[PDB]
Amino acid sequence: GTSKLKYVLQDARFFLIKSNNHENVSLAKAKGVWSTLPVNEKKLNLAFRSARSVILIFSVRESGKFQGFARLSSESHHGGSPIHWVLPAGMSAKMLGGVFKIDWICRRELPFTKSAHLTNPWNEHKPVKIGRDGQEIELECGTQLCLLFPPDESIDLYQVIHKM
Ligand SMILES: CNc1nc(Cl)nc2c1ncn2Cc1cccc(Cl)c1
Numbered sequence: 001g002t003s004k005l006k007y008v009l010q011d012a013r014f015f016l017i018k019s020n021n022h023e024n025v026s027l028a029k030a031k032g033v034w035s036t037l038p039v040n041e042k043k044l045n046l047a048f049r050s051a052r053s054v055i056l057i058f059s060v061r062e063s064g065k066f067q068g069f070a071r072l073s074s075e076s077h078h079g080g081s082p083i084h085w086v087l088p089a090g091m092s093a094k095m096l097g098g099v100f101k102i103d104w105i106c107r108r109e110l111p112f113t114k115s116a117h118l119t120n121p122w123n124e125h126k127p128v129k130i131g132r133d134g135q136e137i138e139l140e141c142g143t144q145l146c147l148l149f150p151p152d153e154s155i156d157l158y159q160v161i162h163k164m
Contacts, residue, residue: 002147004157008071008105008164012053014142015044018133019060020088025067028058029107033083034070035096040134044100045075052164056102057137057145059129066110066129069146070102073163077101103160106152110145118145 017034019025028034034056036044047054054072059065076098085096112129119125121138128137128145137145 002151004161005105005147006143008053008157008160009055009143009146010053011051012055012071012139012142013047013051014055014057014137014139014145015040015047016128016131016133016135016137017056017058018131019058020091021086022060022063022067023086025058025060027083027085028070028102029068029104031083032073032102032104034100034102035076035083035085035098036100036134037095038098041076041098041100043134043136044072048072048075055105055142055146057142064112066112066115066145066149068104068107068109068152069149070104071160071163072100073103074101103163104152104155105157105160106146106149106155108150108152110149114148115145118148 057069058067118128118141120128120141122136123131
């Protein structure tokens with residue numbers, strides 16, 4: 001069902017994550033971690049303290065799709081396993097310092113064609129697929145977007161609810 005999912009999304013905050021390549025999203029799904037640039041890292045740390053759930057919605061640039069969504073389980077933390085991110089052009093490993101732990105809620109894809117009816121008030125009511133890395137998505141838009149993804153029956157949200 002969708003009842004536990006709706007409970008996790010209650011009063012959540014949502015952020016669009018834009019990755020330049022598929023390898024980093026695959027790594028994030030395997031290891032339960034994400035790293036972003038310092039401007040977005042500061043925003044996510046503030047949001048994590050402010051809301052019962054902070055949801056990252058992932059899209060690989062040029063894929064025409066979202067690749068899933070996950071809930072922050074921690075603020076960013078430095079020191080340890082230099083996650084073997086595949087660095088794009090103007091990207092250092094010091095920029096991707098700061099590792100958040102995340103719990104995946106859905107690892108299934110959603111094509112942009114399915115979200116064309118959803119606009120984001122925090123980005124001028126442009127279609128929710130449009131936005132820079134770190135763009136916040138308003139509650140109602142974000143909730144509806146997450147509910148469009150195919151159910152991921154491999155995930156049990158019982159443990160996620162207990163983190164809350
Ligand atoms: C593991 N984290 C990330 N991995 C990848 Cl491949 N792209 C990311 C990531 N975070 C933001 N972006 C998009 C981007 C923003 C500004 C400059 C560049 Cl070159 C790319």
